[PDB]
Design a protein around this ligand. Structure first.
Ligand code: HEM
Length: 446
């Protein structure tokens, strides 16, 4: 491989064919940040025989990705669902189900879903559910606690899975965590033999449990999940692959909200002034909105991937023209820019609770890089034409959990001086970051 005219800088690495595959996978943010410092806002890396052009000029993300004739999302999605979920969906219409997700998670459907979520969370934060039948205080990891509560809430709400009792929901959650922990390694083909066995064992249990085969529950074909299942059935997808698809939809709907709620609570518990303004506001939620947006800036790290299906000319904001080559991949990583970009957000590694608030506590919208307006200073839900359809529901759920914890419980750090844990670097690229260890807490009924 050799650079052609106006192609991005090329970085092959020293390992023939394999290139940067290992380093890229181990900590995508560290590697792509290193590459940005070396080459600038656009560069092409070799990884496992493939060439991946990375674009980090956030002013171009929307316009570049709008070219669906030159930039395919479907092929890499198929790769991931094979590797992670052991799934193949032949003759599958992807746009029809994405349209269903948009509609089902907005408007009157959203209000219904959100009302059910509120009800379900209440059932899950009972003293008995909260492990408070033995003692005044209960110790837990905050991440584990927030993930457990929202996973269970979202699962009950989205899958309508009341057939599962309390102990059953815990079993399902713990198996999901087992699988979820190994998901990045599955995506990257970096599982060892023991991990591969664990992931496969976990998937099989989840395939069985998420489809209650033994029961005669009449399908709700007008619901989000029921209409999805009905589509697969009409497309000729067999029962077994229908079972496997449930784990895909479980991960897509449950893999982010609880982790995000953890970071919100982590940042708040470790930032007294932030927590005071939030609690005061509980007594329109402008402060909490800034808190949540700041949390997502720091922790929403989905990587956007496309296959380049034809040669494409592109212009960065400075006017320089670059050529994308057919057969390559294009990646866009909003986590690095604009979210963690020090030229847009000063001290970007710092949680500043009011970073998106003006002096008079109005919404701060004015953000700049080197004397140029930045249209989207944070991109947690994805690029403008490919937004998370569940985002409004995600925010409702995160708010509901945070509101309940602060209102109905006393929550204390076990180590009064603790800061939030570091990030597990395997999570970069897959959505909300997860902590390396946990933040140990104690809680009691307030
Ligand atoms: C903070 C929490 C969440 C974040 C940050 C988030 C973010 C994202 C992002 C960035 C994507 C784009 C896919 C990609 O390029 O990898 C996506 C897709 C999607 N999200 Fe969310 N999400 C969250 C929670 C949720 C929730 C609670 C739901 C629904 C209950 C949901 C439903 C979906 C669906 C159905 C897709 C489309 C999957 C596909 O078409 O392949 N998400 N999400």
């Amino acid at each position: 491989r050799t650079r052609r005219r106006n192609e991005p800088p090329l970085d092959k690495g020293m390992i023939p064919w394999l290139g940067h595959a290992l380093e890229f996978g181990k900590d995508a943010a560290k590697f792509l940040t290193r590459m940005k410092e070396k080459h600038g806002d656009i560069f092409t890396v070799r990884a496992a025989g493939l060439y991946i052009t990375v674009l980090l000029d956030s002013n171009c993300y929307d316009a570049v990705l709008s070219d669906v004739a030159s930039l395919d999302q479907t092929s890499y999605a198929q790769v991931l669902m094979k590797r992670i979920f052991n799934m193949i969906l032949p003759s599958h219409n992807p746009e029809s189900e994405k349209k269903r997700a948009e509609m089902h998670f907005q408007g009157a459907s959203l209000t219904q879903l959100s009302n059910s979520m509120q009800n379900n969370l209440r059932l899950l934060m009972t003293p008995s559910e909260m492990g408070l039948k033995t003692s005044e205080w209960k110790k837990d990891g905050l991440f584990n606690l927030c993930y457990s509560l929202l996973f269970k809430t979202g699962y009950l709400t989205v899958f309508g899975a009341e057939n599962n009792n309390s102990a059953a929901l815990t079993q399902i959650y713990e198996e999901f965590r087992r699988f979820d922990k190994l998901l990045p390694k599955l995506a990257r083909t970096t599982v060892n033999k023991e991990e591969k066995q664990i992931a496969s064992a976990a998937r099989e249990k989840l395939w069985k449990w998420l489809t209650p085969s033994g029961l005669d529950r009449k399908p709700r074909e007008q619901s989000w999940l029921g209409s999805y299942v009905k589509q697969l059935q009409d497309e000729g997808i067999d029962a077994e692959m229908q079972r496997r698809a449930m784990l895909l939809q479980l991960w897509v709907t449950q893999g982010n909200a609880g982790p995000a709620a953890f970071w919100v609570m982590g940042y708040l518990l470790t930032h007294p002034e932030a927590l005071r303004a939030v609690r005061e506001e509980i007594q329109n939620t402008p402060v909490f909105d800034s808190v949540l947006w700041e949390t997502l800036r720091l922790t929403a790290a989905a990587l956007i991937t496309r296959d380049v299906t034809q040669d494409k000319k592109i212009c960065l904001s400075n006017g320089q023209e670059y050529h994308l080559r057919r057969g390559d991949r294009l990646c866009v990583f909003p986590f690095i820019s604009p979210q963690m970009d020090p030229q847009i957000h000063q001290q970007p590694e710092m949680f500043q609770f009011d970073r998106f608030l003006n002096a008079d506590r109005t919404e701060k919208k004015d953000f700049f890089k080197n004397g140029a307006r930045v249209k989207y200073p944070s991109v947690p839900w994805g690029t403008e034409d490919n937004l998370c359809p569940g985002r409004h529901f995600a925010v409702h759920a995160i708010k509901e959990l945070v509101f309940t914890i602060l209102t109905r419980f006393d929550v204390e750090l076990c180590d009064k001086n603790a800061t939030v844990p570091l990030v597990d670097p395997s999570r970069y690229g897959f959505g909300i970051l997860q902590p390396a260890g946990d933040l140990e807490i104690r809680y009691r009924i307030r």
